[model samples]
Target chain A: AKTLEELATERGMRMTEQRRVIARILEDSEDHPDVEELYRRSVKVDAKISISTVYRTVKLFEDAGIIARHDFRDGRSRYETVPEEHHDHLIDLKTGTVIEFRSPEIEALQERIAREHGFRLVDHRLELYGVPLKK
Target chain B: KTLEELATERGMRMTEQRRVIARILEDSEDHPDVEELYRRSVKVDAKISISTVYRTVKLFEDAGIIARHDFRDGRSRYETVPEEHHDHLIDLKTGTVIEFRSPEIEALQERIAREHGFRLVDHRLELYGVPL
Candidate 1:
């Protein structure tokens, strides 16, 4: 698969050096990082990059479907690259950590529930918050 | 316990505004945000302030007497703690919310949590879809 930055380029988005820096940072990120974290990372690549640029770049990437934005019940939104396969998040309430998982059964059940309700399945958000089970 | 009774048990003072807001919350069937809550509160007590609504909601949430939800919307919605846990389904076209419970999903969540070596404590699930 093409990297997110490459996809953005292919979509005809202006690939400025700052945008490229931010895109590379997002592409390299394995965890969902909010805008502030993204800004911190992007600054290492180009000190001239502003937080607003990071914000605008992510919003552009999100609108183009190159990235996904998550709320996770946190005060700020977080971002991850669009995945080839869909997944849900399990949050660690005690530590603010997010773990991603995918369950086909749960996905099917969601669609079934939506159908039973006379709605067509479009999109969904599921976040599970928990503490580590004691040994 | 009645709303006021629960508050008093938690050592919360029952100001007339708190009493009125608690009544409004208890009577609510759908999830209402702070603004909607403030609107309903003023009908019973004109002295009710938005700041009071915000503080009271935070207090209730901290006490675990109420559950706050962000259904992918910008604002947080509030509901009384349900006897049984439930998930939400949001209608994309109309912005309507439907509540549901799935035993299978619930069990799967626990299993998934255990698989990750974490105890299943709490979870938030919302499905956004449109009518067929």
Candidate 2:
């Protein structure tokens, strides 16, 4: 994982204090912090970071591929840093946690199925939402 | 009630396009796109407008008479709602679709989510690949 300064420099982003605060909150490697969470944390370090700046900075990160945004059942957008390869998400309706996973079998099957069609697969989204099975 | 029954119930005279659409869906093995359907249907009668076909199919989907699918393409595909519910896998090459179901897979997904602290409300899973 790159440091805040390194990440900002690599992405050609301006290294402002507000951007630094936003970067620290996101750089934690866990916690898929939404804009509200970022805003809350930013105020703890710097109270002057307005909500609009946070929203715009998050959008900039997202556009730069430094962050990824997703929509869960909450009907609002949540964001995390983008991963290298494509994968699917499993959402917990009880706690609103998002987990990422990959299955080789499923991936292989997709390739086979698409081949049967005659068009090359470009991109797709596969989200599975469910409650845990009882033991 | 079945389509035949619904047709009679509404007193909406069942036209040839309705029958053609019904028959094409029923006869289809691979889920067919609307354009492919329109092509096959034009042979039955050239007078049937594509607009009517779109409208009729949309009605069927809205009424639960059929199910629509998003193959990740601009246009959607559909199949007759069978007696049983099942998911689909799309063929990336030919754009072919195959219906499949696995209760075990469904159960595992629910378990995985809840174990991480979530209740599984709804899920969407689509497998894409070339035919082996």
Candidate 3:
């Protein structure tokens, strides 16, 4: 997979040190992270990074389809690098952890539903909020 | 229960403003944000304040009498708590919403969550697309 920084460069983003640092931080993150979390990680590598910069960079990457933004009914937006394969999220309501999974049946059903409504399935999001099942 | 009854049962004080707002929400079929709710509300009673609308909506939501949805839009949209669960399909071109329910999807979510050791409590699903 191409690094998010490489993808941004291909998309004609200016390779500023700040953008590169933020991209690397996003690429390195396995968990879906919010802007504040991104900024915290970013400043560890470079002291000059700002939360606003993190926000701007994230928006730019999202616009370019290099990253995806999500809101799991939470007040703030969270982000992840756009993956090679698309997946939906199942969020742990108690722990705020995100689990990623894909379903062919759900994908097919979405396409059929859109077609039935005279539209094509351009994109979709499915987030399941749940508590841990009892042992 | 009616919004007013729900409010009273939840022990929320039924000020005049809350009564008007509650009525507006109960009568609403489309999802409306606080501003839109307030706009509809003032037509019924002009004295209703926007801040009161905000507070009352939050109160209703916190009490689980309403559902607050973020359909990738900046604003929070609200609807009366549903008797059956549904998902949303957003028409990106026209900015309208279509609601849908799938028993298969619902069952699959429960199964998937259990497989992950999480009992499904709630969920949100939104599809964004253009007209064919």
Candidate 4:
């Protein structure tokens, strides 16, 4: 439950005040935000933070496992703190929105399929893409 | 027959090399990346090269004659265009892939897409697990 900033600091990565500012932005948001969105938020707090700085800091945090990155078949990447529980993504084609969902039925089916195949489950990924049902 | 017809239908030139590559893919029961396909290809026809396998795979995939998947491994693996869709489960212990289809899971995906106000366009699911 530690914030990414604290996790980064504990891991002994240099957290300049600007990196701290970016990390706090990451901490406050629940929605998955790409680096561009992160930059928009960071500059609102500190105009000195550069886009390149956001890019580098996000990369550093990702490599250090402070955040998880995802690409929902969108042209760009997205970021979220590692989750406490596993979930799948449903990508809205009309609006590029990602909806996080957890289905015990699907999860159980995966586990059962693995067991039927003589394997113990380790990890998985499921992404659904869709367009608006009606105009 | 399918790959040959499909490739030619897509207006591709089917070389003797592509003929054998097509044969290899048609006859393969397992998902094979270019290197694996090449390994099998050269034994049957020594003229077949890795680049040939790569290009043929890309061409077939682009033409929708074959499907490509990334099993979290660096290599892009392949299978023939499925008659029906299925998901893949990777055996991390040895990198073996097991394919499975579940109506329940498929239905859930469609339902979730609707609940989110969208018609399901497409979906992808891959599972990684070890042997018991």
Top candidate on TM-score is 4
Model 2: CA > 4 A from native:
A1-5, A29-47, A71-74, A84-87, A102-126, A131-135, B3-29, B55-65, B72-75, B81-83, B117-121
What order do you get sorting by TM-score, best first?
A: 4, 2, 1, 3
> Could you tell me how far off, in angstroms, the CA of residue B23 lies in candidate 4 after the best superposition?
1.9
Let me know the DockQ for model 2. Answer: 0.30
| Candidates in descending DockQ order | 4, 1, 3, 2
Give the per-residue lDDT of model 1 (tens digit) for A29-125. Answer: 7667889998998898799999999999999898788888887664458788887887888877675656788888888888899999988888887
Tens-digit per-residue lDDT, B1-132, candidate 4: 678888999998889999889988988868877888899899999988788888888888888888888778555788887687888888777667788888888888899889878889899999888888
Cα displacement (Å) at residue B4, model 1: 2.6
C-alpha TM-score for every candidate: 0.67, 0.68, 0.66, 0.86
Tell me candidate 4's fraction of native contacts, as a decimal between 0 and 1: 0.97
Report lDDT (CA) for all predictions: 0.83, 0.69, 0.83, 0.84
Better of 1 and 3 by TM-score: 1
Cα RMSD to native, each candidate?
Answer: 4.8, 4.9, 5.0, 2.6
Consecutive 10-residue window with the lowest summed lDDT within model 1 chain B:
B68-77
lDDT of 2: 0.69
Which parts of model 1 are misplaced by more than 4 Å?
A: A5-29, A33-78, A92-97, A130-135, B8-13, B34-59, B62-64, B73-75, B92-96, B114-119
Chain A TM-score of prediction number 4: 0.84
Interface root-mean-square deviation of model 3 in angstroms is 1.3
* CAPRI-style quality class for the chain A–B interface of candidate 2: acceptable
